[PDB]
Enzyme design. Structure first.
Site, PDB file in Angstrom:
ATOM      1  N   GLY A  31       9.154  -3.194  -6.847  1.00 24.06           N
ATOM      2  CA  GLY A  31       8.318  -3.622  -5.738  1.00 24.06           C
ATOM      3  C   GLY A  31       6.981  -2.795  -5.557  1.00 24.06           C
ATOM      4  O   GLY A  31       6.990  -1.537  -6.114  1.00 24.06           O
ATOM      5  N   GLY A  34       4.043  -1.191   0.684  1.00 23.27           N
ATOM      6  CA  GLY A  34       4.637  -0.380   1.352  1.00 23.27           C
ATOM      7  C   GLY A  34       4.181   0.880   1.076  1.00 23.27           C
ATOM      8  O   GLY A  34       4.932   2.184   1.252  1.00 23.27           O
ATOM      9  N   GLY A  36       3.032   2.550  -1.408  1.00 20.22           N
ATOM     10  CA  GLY A  36       3.498   3.166  -2.466  1.00 20.22           C
ATOM     11  C   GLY A  36       4.270   2.100  -3.410  1.00 20.22           C
ATOM     12  O   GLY A  36       4.349   0.799  -2.967  1.00 20.22           O
ATOM     13  N   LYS A  51      10.177   5.662  -5.154  1.00 15.62           N
ATOM     14  CA  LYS A  51       8.785   5.412  -4.425  1.00 15.62           C
ATOM     15  C   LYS A  51       7.938   6.333  -4.764  1.00 15.62           C
ATOM     16  O   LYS A  51       8.203   7.403  -4.252  1.00 15.62           O
ATOM     17  CB  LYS A  51       9.352   4.914  -3.002  1.00 15.62           C
ATOM     18  CG  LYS A  51       8.114   4.428  -2.205  1.00 15.62           C
ATOM     19  CD  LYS A  51       7.693   4.569  -0.656  1.00 15.62           C
ATOM     20  CE  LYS A  51       8.766   3.662   0.192  1.00 15.62           C
ATOM     21  NZ  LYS A  51       8.775   3.981   1.544  1.00 15.62           N
ATOM     22  N   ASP A 144       7.020  -1.888  11.227  1.00 19.44           N
ATOM     23  CA  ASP A 144       6.598  -2.790   9.884  1.00 19.44           C
ATOM     24  C   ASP A 144       7.860  -3.508   9.501  1.00 19.44           C
ATOM     25  O   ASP A 144       8.308  -3.611   8.399  1.00 19.44           O
ATOM     26  CB  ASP A 144       6.081  -1.893   8.825  1.00 19.44           C
ATOM     27  CG  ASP A 144       5.337  -2.817   7.930  1.00 19.44           C
ATOM     28  OD1 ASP A 144       4.887  -4.045   8.354  1.00 19.44           O
ATOM     29  OD2 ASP A 144       4.903  -2.202   6.775  1.00 19.44           O
ATOM     30  N   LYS A 146       9.790  -6.649   8.489  1.00 21.90           N
ATOM     31  CA  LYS A 146       9.283  -7.852   7.702  1.00 21.90           C
ATOM     32  C   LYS A 146      10.316  -7.941   6.480  1.00 21.90           C
ATOM     33  O   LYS A 146      11.178  -6.867   6.233  1.00 21.90           O
ATOM     34  CB  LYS A 146       7.846  -7.695   7.335  1.00 21.90           C
ATOM     35  CG  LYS A 146       7.613  -6.423   6.363  1.00 21.90           C
ATOM     36  CD  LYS A 146       6.199  -6.825   5.585  1.00 21.90           C
ATOM     37  CE  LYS A 146       5.772  -5.395   4.935  1.00 21.90           C
ATOM     38  NZ  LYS A 146       4.788  -5.633   4.104  1.00 21.90           N
ATOM     39  N   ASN A 149      10.719  -5.686   3.586  1.00 19.12           N
ATOM     40  CA  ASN A 149      11.096  -4.211   3.872  1.00 19.12           C
ATOM     41  C   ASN A 149      12.770  -4.294   4.325  1.00 19.12           C
ATOM     42  O   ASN A 149      13.052  -3.410   5.032  1.00 19.12           O
ATOM     43  CB  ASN A 149      10.214  -3.491   5.048  1.00 19.12           C
ATOM     44  CG  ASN A 149       8.996  -3.194   4.761  1.00 19.12           C
ATOM     45  OD1 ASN A 149       8.602  -3.125   3.572  1.00 19.12           O
ATOM     46  ND2 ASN A 149       8.204  -2.731   5.620  1.00 19.12           N
ATOM     47  N   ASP A 162      11.444   1.869   4.715  1.00 17.61           N
ATOM     48  CA  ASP A 162       9.943   1.870   5.091  1.00 17.61           C
ATOM     49  C   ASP A 162       9.742   2.382   6.629  1.00 17.61           C
ATOM     50  O   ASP A 162       9.506   1.621   7.449  1.00 17.61           O
ATOM     51  CB  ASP A 162       8.836   0.737   5.013  1.00 17.61           C
ATOM     52  CG  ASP A 162       8.403   0.750   3.580  1.00 17.61           C
ATOM     53  OD1 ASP A 162       7.137   0.164   3.182  1.00 17.61           O
ATOM     54  OD2 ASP A 162       8.814   1.514   2.590  1.00 17.61           O
TER      55      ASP A 162
END
Ligand SMILES: Cn1cc(NC(=O)c2cnn3ccc(N4CCNCC4)nc23)c(C(N)=O)n1
EC number: 2.7.11.1
Length: 288
Positions: A31, A34, A36, A51, A144, A146, A149, A162
């Site tokens: 992915g 984010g 990163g 990450k 954040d 969503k 995440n 995140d």
């Protein structure tokens, strides 16, 4: 709680030098976004998510905030940080691998994965709300929330991720407005920092779960998913017109019950929205 200090070159080696290609072709990128990029790796006899982050000083503040929050926050509905890396050029955060990826990908059936059932979706909604409840109980504001995440493990358990933009409480204001527009509360778009904004964003997530539609689609009417709440309220359409067709186990009652929670979450006046413990209760009552 503390974490292991991984070597940058161990992470670089297990992620095939942080490969940008997908897993199907023969790469490691899982992915992106984010603040990163997330790569796949195998370290200490187990599969992991690494990450690599990626103002450079504000990026390390996001690195330090994520470790601070994870040291303080261990829960079954949050991702699990195994360690980190600072010695190399880039900053890395090592997690327990979540085989089913993000809710966004699962709702869009990215790569041909089968559509999530309603039964799976109720479990995810409940689990996600338990993760946000844990953060709010520990005086943390996510900033954040969503579907990209929310991660899904081996058993489709919801894992909130995140925490780089997270804030403590334990109503503040800021000149640096951060988050994803399509999920953000009106006050959050204006600079306010409050846990009430996390609830609004979680309402957009519940609409993505019900409809399978992304929060924002450039080639759609309405382009923003949160506007369907008005179409339903100003009775032009109903929630059944928006239910995800890619489900065979979704009954009208429980769907309407989830939508009721989303409608309450999406109240424009921040003080009228329910707190997370109430969202949690209503989602528990829905199943049951
Ligand atoms: C299959 N699989 C496992 C994945 N990713 C993970 O297994 C994963 C584990 N912890 N963690 C923490 C954050 C994060 N991302 C943050 C930014 N938004 C994307 C998720 N992904 C992960 C993924 C993925 N798409 O990241 N796909």
């Amino acid at each position: 709680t503390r974490f292991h200090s991984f070597s940058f070159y161990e992470l670089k080696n297990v992620t095939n030098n942080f490969d940008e290609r997908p897993i199907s072709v023969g790469g490691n990128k899982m992915g992106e976004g984010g603040f990163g990029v997330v790569y796949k790796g195998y370290v200490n006899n187990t599969t992991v998510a690494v990450k690599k982050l990626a103002t450079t000083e504000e990026l390390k503040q996001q690195f330090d905030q994520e470790i601070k929050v994870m040291a303080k926050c261990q829960h079954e509905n949050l991702v699990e940080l195994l360690g980190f890396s600072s010695d190399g050029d880039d900053l890395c955060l090592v997690y327990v691998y979540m085989p089913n990826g993000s809710l966004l990908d699962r709702l869009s059936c990215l790569d041909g994965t089968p559509p999530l059932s309603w039964h799976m979706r109720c479990k995810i909604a409940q689990g996600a709300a338990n993760g946000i409840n844990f953060l709010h109980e520990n005086h943390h504001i996510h900033r954040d929330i969503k579907s990209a995440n929310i991660l899904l493990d081996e058993a489709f358990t919801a894992k909130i991720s995140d925490f780089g933009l997270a804030r403590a409480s334990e109503t503040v204001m800021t000149s640096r407005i951060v988050g994803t527009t399509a999920y953000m509360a009106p006050e959050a778009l204006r600079g306010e920092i409050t846990p009430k904004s996390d609830i609004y964003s979680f309402g957009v997530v519940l609409l993505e779960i019900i409809t399978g539609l992304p929060a924002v689609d450039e080639h759609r009417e309405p382009q923003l998913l949160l506007d369907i709440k008005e179409e339903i309220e100003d009775e032009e359409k109903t929630i059944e017109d928006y239910i995800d067709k890619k489900m065979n186990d979704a009954d009208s009652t429980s769907v309407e019950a989830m939508y009721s929670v989303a409608s309450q979450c999406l109240h424009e006046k921040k003080n009228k929205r329910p707190d997370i413990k109430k969202v949690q209760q209503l989602l528990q009552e829905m199943t049951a």
